[PDB]
């Protein structure tokens, strides 16, 4: 039970700034879905990151591409998710920086799956928005341990702090799910491209 003070403080500050954080997340996702030049940029920097993780901006692009791509496997169930986690494990064996990214993405997959199998559809989507608000605040400050901690809390079923954060943003949670639907094709393609690139540098 409970959570570390750094995680409590990230939740407190994200709730104070939740109109800003949730609004910026939704608008970035809308811009990405409607701007093909932004999609090409994320994809080419993600491919560079597979060959060389040293630049934080390239590794961020790899994380964004895989966080969008993972929605496919999550909606396909246990076999697809196990294959996706197997791919992340192979990615993590490449270097210590790749391992840090892969460990974060594995926790994000597990958080999604816990929510979907235990909550109603609307509570699932709203809790996810509150969780990602805290995660984005932590990552923007370079605090990767706090970001992963928030995901672990949801894996264990402690959804209530994150649902509570996003309750007044239920409409934005629905719109963020409408936007993911426009990205299904992008995600399937980029996942196949990353899988091929990882095989090449093994
Ligand atoms: Mg290299
Ligand atoms: Mg460099």
Author numbering: -1 to 200
What does the paper say about this structure?
Here we present rotamer inverted fragment finder–diffusion (Riff-Diff), a hybrid machine learning and atomistic modelling strategy for scaffolding catalytic arrays in de novo proteins. We highlight the general applicability of Riff-Diff by designing enzymes for two mechanistically distinct chemical transformations, the retro-aldol reaction and the Morita–Baylis–Hillman reaction. We show that in both cases, it is possible to generate catalysts that exhibit activities rivalling those optimized by in vitro evolution, along with exquisite stereoselectivity. High-resolution structures of six of the designs revealed near-atomic active site design precision.
